[PDB]
Amino acid sequence: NLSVENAAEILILADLHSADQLKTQAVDFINYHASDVLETSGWKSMVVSHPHLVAEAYRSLASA
Amino acid sequence: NLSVENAAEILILADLHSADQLKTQAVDFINYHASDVLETSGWKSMVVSHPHLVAEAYRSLASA
C-alpha cells in the first residue's frame, strides 16, 4: 500500500510509532522512487516538519 | 579546501550566496564522503537549520 503520493507520510507515521520494518520499507520505496516522490506535497512538507527523516533517507541511499 | 568537517557549512554558505559551482562541488563532496560527513556537527546542525539543503543533497545522490 505504499504509493508515491503517500510514501513520505507513511515514513513519518512509521517513525512516530517506531515501526522499524515499515520505516525500512518506506525509505527503500522513497529511494527507489525518488524522482517522483520529490515532487509530492508529502515529501515537501516532510522536509520542513521532519528533516531528520530526510537525513535518514539520505543515509540509506548513500550506503546503497 | 573542502573538508569532511567543513563541507555542510560550505554548502550553507554556497547556498546563501547563490554560488552555483561551489554548491555543486560541496554537494558532490558530501555525497562522496557521506559516511564521514554524517558524523559531523556541521551536518547535524544543517539538518535542523537548512533542511532544504539536505533535500538538495538527497536529490543529487538519487540522480547519480
Side-chain angles (χ1 to χ4, degrees):
Chain A
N1 293 299
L2 278 159
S3 67
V4 160
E5 63 275 18
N6 78 11
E9 291 153 325
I10 292 291
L11 178 50
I12 291 164
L13 296 175
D15 179 73
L16 178 57
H17 297 299
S18 297
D20 293 341
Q21 194 193 32
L22 184 55
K23 182 174 217 183
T24 298
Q25 288 168 12
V27 167
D28 287 346
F29 184 97
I30 292 169
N31 291 342
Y32 198 65
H33 295 285
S35 56
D36 289 324
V37 169
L38 271 42
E39 298 307 315
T40 66
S41 51
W43 171 267
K44 295 174 180 175
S45 291
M46 189 182 79
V47 169
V48 176
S49 67
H50 299 76
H52 65 284
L53 291 174
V54 177
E56 177 152 9
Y58 181 87
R59 178 186 283 281
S60 173
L61 182 60
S63 67
Chain B
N1 293 299
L2 278 159
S3 67
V4 160
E5 63 275 18
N6 78 11
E9 291 153 325
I10 292 291
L11 178 50
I12 291 164
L13 296 175
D15 179 74
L16 178 57
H17 297 299
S18 297
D20 293 341
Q21 194 193 32
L22 184 55
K23 182 174 217 183
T24 298
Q25 288 168 12
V27 167
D28 287 346
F29 184 97
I30 292 169
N31 291 342
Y32 198 65
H33 295 285
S35 56
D36 289 324
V37 169
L38 271 42
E39 298 307 315
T40 66
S41 51
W43 171 267
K44 295 174 180 175
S45 291
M46 189 182 79
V47 169
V48 176
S49 67
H50 299 76
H52 65 284
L53 291 174
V54 177
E56 177 152 9
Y58 181 87
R59 178 186 283 281
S60 173
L61 182 60
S63 67

